[PDB]
Amino acid sequence: LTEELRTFPINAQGDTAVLSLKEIKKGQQVFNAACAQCHALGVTRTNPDVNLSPEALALATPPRDNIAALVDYIKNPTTYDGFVEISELHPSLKSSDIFPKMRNISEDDLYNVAGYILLQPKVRGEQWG
Amino acid sequence: LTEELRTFPINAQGDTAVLSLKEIKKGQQVFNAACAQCHALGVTRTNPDVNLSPEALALATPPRDNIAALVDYIKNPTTYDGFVEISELHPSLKSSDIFPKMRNISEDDLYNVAGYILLQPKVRGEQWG
Ligand code: HEC
Ligand code: HEC
Numbered sequence: 001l002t003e004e005l006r007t008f009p010i011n012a013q014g015d016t017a018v019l020s021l022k023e024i025k026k027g028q029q030v031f032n033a034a035c036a037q038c039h040a041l042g043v044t045r046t047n048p049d050v051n052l053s054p055e056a057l058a059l060a061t062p063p064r065d066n067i068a069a070l071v072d073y074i075k076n077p078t079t080y081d082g083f084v085e086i087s088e089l090h091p092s093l094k095s096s097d098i099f100p101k102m103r104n105i106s107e108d109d110l111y112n113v114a115g116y117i118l119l120q121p122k123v124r125g126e127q128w129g
Numbered sequence: 130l131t132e133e134l135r136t137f138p139i140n141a142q143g144d145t146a147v148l149s150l151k152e153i154k155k156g157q158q159v160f161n162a163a164c165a166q167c168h169a170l171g172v173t174r175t176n177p178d179v180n181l182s183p184e185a186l187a188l189a190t191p192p193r194d195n196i197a198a199l200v201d202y203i204k205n206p207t208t209y210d211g212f213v214e215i216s217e218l219h220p221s222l223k224s225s226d227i228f229p230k231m232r233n234i235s236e237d238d239l240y241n242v243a244g245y246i247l248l249q250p251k252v253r254g255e256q257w258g
């Protein structure tokens with residue numbers, strides 16, 4: 001896994017960040033623990049269109065195709081059109097009541113899961129999402 | 130439990146229906162199995178304002194203060210302002226994927242749970258919601 005594949009847009013301004021492989025291993029864990037229930041393989045079980053594929057992410061509002069945007073999303077989940085807050089029903093830090101796995105999640109983890117999500121299509125191609 | 134307390138508005142047109150106590154016992158079961166996780170005591174764990182109290186229900190869009198409206202809600206969940214469908218994240222029949230307890234739910238059950246929900250404030254007063 002070259003440093004190239006591990007280079008992702010950290011924000012929407014185009015800035016790049018190189019994540020360590022270790023962080024990605026941790027992102028996967030958090031992901032497999034708190035997201036795989038409805039997102040295994042980068043899909044969205046109950047909403048096929050709003051996937052974890054680059055295309056879907058890029059077309060979200062705002063685009064969720066960069067680490068910052070993905071981190072924001074977990075901290076403050078919103079519908080695809082991004083105008084209705086769904087933190088009450090979607091896993092988030094203010095939703096840890098009905099989502100036990102969100103009680104010990106830290107920014108570092110959010111950062112890692114974000115890198116993990118963005119990594120998958122680079123390595124699994126269209127198998128992801 | 131007189132037949133009076135068991136008289137509820139079946140629809141928004143003001144029609145009344147008298148449910149049997151037996152049906153209410155069954156509604157409670159379905160409720161305790163599929164709703165108590167976020168609605169025990171008629172509350173909404175992750176959204177305090179959108180409760181199961183008569184006032185909140187009556188102020189929903191459309192009002193969810195009659196059996197038909199409540200049944201519709203479970204079949205097709207929508208935000209409080211009733212304009213965003215949240216069946217993908219809220220228990221419903223098209224949401225039974227992530228909500229196992231919704232796989233064997235029948236209209237009869239929906240009808241019973243609806244009666245149960247509407248019964249609680251009549252017997253628990255403000256303790257409910
Ligand atoms: C089921 C209970 C879910 C779990 C567990 C997680 N997510 Fe989810 N997510 C879910 C739905 C039904 C939706 C669509 C909401 C809508 O109406 O738009 C989503 C969406 C996302 C997205 C946005 C996808 C996109 O814009 O294309 C992301 C970034 C996302 N979810 C990430 C994510 C993560 C990291 C999770 C774990 C912390 C997670 N989700 C859990 C349903 C569910
Ligand atoms: C995982 C959590 C969860 C479960 C389980 C759940 N609900 Fe909800 N429910 C919510 C949330 C959160 C809302 C608020 C949605 C909104 O308006 O944004 C809600 C709202 C509702 C409302 C509308 C309340 C109002 O005042 O308008 C009703 C009716 C309702 N749920 C009934 C049920 C019933 C019946 C079940 C079971 C079949 C159920 N819910 C299971 C989380 C849950």
